[PDB]
Symmetry: C3
Subunit: 243 residues, 3 copies
Amino acid sequence: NAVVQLTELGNGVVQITMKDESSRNGFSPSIVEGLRHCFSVVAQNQQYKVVILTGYGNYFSSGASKEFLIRKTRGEVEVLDLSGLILDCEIPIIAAMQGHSFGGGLLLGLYADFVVFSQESVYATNFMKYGFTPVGATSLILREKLGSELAQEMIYTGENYRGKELAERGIPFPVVSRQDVLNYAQQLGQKIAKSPRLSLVALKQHLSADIKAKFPEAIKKELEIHQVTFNQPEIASRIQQEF
Amino acid sequence: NAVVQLTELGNGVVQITMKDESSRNGFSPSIVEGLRHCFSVVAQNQQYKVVILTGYGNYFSSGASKEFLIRKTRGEVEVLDLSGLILDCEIPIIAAMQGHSFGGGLLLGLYADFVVFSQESVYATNFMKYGFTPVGATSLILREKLGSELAQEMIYTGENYRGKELAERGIPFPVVSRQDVLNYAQQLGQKIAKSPRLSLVALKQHLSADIKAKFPEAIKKELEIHQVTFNQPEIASRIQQEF
Amino acid sequence: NAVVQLTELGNGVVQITMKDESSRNGFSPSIVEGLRHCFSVVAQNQQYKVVILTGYGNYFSSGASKEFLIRKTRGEVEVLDLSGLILDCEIPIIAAMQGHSFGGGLLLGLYADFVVFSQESVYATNFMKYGFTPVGATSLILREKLGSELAQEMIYTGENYRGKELAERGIPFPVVSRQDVLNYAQQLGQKIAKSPRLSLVALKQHLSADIKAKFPEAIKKELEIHQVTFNQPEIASRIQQEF
Ligand SMILES: [Cl-]
Ligand SMILES: [Cl-]
Ligand SMILES: [Cl-]
């Protein structure tokens, strides 16, 4: 079976579930392709009104793998960018992050319209842990959605934060026990789906406008700085020591 | 007696009290006219420094009536906009929302410089409950003042939130028991009124500048989308079922 | 010994400590000159990665003195602006505000990248207490860093807020007991300093860009309004009564 699966929850709410156990929901070729496919299916079914994006087990999304980053130090690969995949979806998305989210994997959820975190799981913008600056419009999205201060500390330190620690810190998203994350998202999705699809699409376009206007330049600027800071002598060794 | 009354609280603090019991402080012709009149009186008295805007009993403001919305589906009336009334006032305003605030009625309070909510009362941007998108620069004002995440959820769902629920959610305004709302506002007003009027007027103009610059386009854009989403076949029936 | 001293904490973290007991860390000529000197020393040592800025005893920074303000009413002096001093530093700064911070002294800390407040100490943007409008891009910086609502109330009232009161209000910075403030800052600094200096400098430039773009006009606009509201008949007497 494909590693990304779409299921119907009723009343126009659907769930896209990532389950690439081999990569722990990393940005593997099969995850990228399965996300593209499932979002294509969503775009084609006019009856769908809300997407719930979620992981499996202990993982929401692990982002780019350390093996991938090592390949990148040799100039073997370029930067993965799944933002267009998520941002192109015209109906509201709730990211039910029932498991850990690291780097690009945290951004993947934060690109969504609503986000739910697990109390027990760990979340990180870990770029600076490896010693280099973010990609993916990290600063734009984190400042908008987590607030400038959490965004600042998470980006500078690159550390792992449990959901509970983020809640205690006043993160402006719900943080609930792992076994309740998906249920919470589903309940919110059903409330949202009470509205006509036309109104949901129109509202989302309106609400998303300001960030969408700023997104391309944000991606470009982060990419440019990333290319300088990633390609420094000591980075390969720093990545090696995180395995 | 007129349904909107102005009283003096001392030291330049004044109270404008809405009491159209027949419409539960809806955007009735008498409320609109009485607000215009009382704000005219304020503009003319140089001794006034702070306005406290409040309701009566269980209601702060009910916004546009369901009867009005039904008339609108027939093209009988156009969209009410009380923003200019509030935003034109040059001295600070505290909205003492001791009662419920629905739709335009919640926005009416949020146009103020300071806002106090009742723990027991209910608050909603209920446009999407009826199935159509907001008016009144709802997204601009809610994102600025409640934060992007509360704003997102309240606008998408259209649901009723008690003050207590909003406080638990980390709303950045004081939320106190209903019997304490007006007193809290009055105490804050007296602190503010310790400053020279010239300085209050100058400061408010400075602080209000960025939102005021964005307001006209926000109103226009919301109006345009509203006209499309309001005029869809199923909306009249949705409004009917909310009586 | 000089009233501002630089010490090394290890791993590239340094501490700049203000101790002008005679002015309670006011914007005295010796504080201004000692801050300039110590930040020059920092700029010249490539091994330094994080600056912790702190006070002594009960005071972080008292900003402009009342004696200074009285001199200003006579047109004896112009407005002090230490923003360029702080904003020019290319490495991250943590303001460990273990003591009180008043007026420009609160802004001095808030210009930093990270800020830690004492539970027991008092904080104020006290301009309006004297009866005149802020300087130093107060509204820009407070709205960005404390949030629009705390910023609004603190600026309008000019009152003294204990750290504890700000924490209860949901301020988005850590607030800890006075005896723990510097330790907390030092611990955060050591986490930050784990990154390569090149990456810290690049990230800070990127993150600071939007505020830096807006800063000059903010300073200019506040200065212009300040000049009008400060030079009103009753201000000298208001300042007199705050001694
Ligand atoms: Cl479904
Ligand atoms: Cl009065
Ligand atoms: Cl050191």
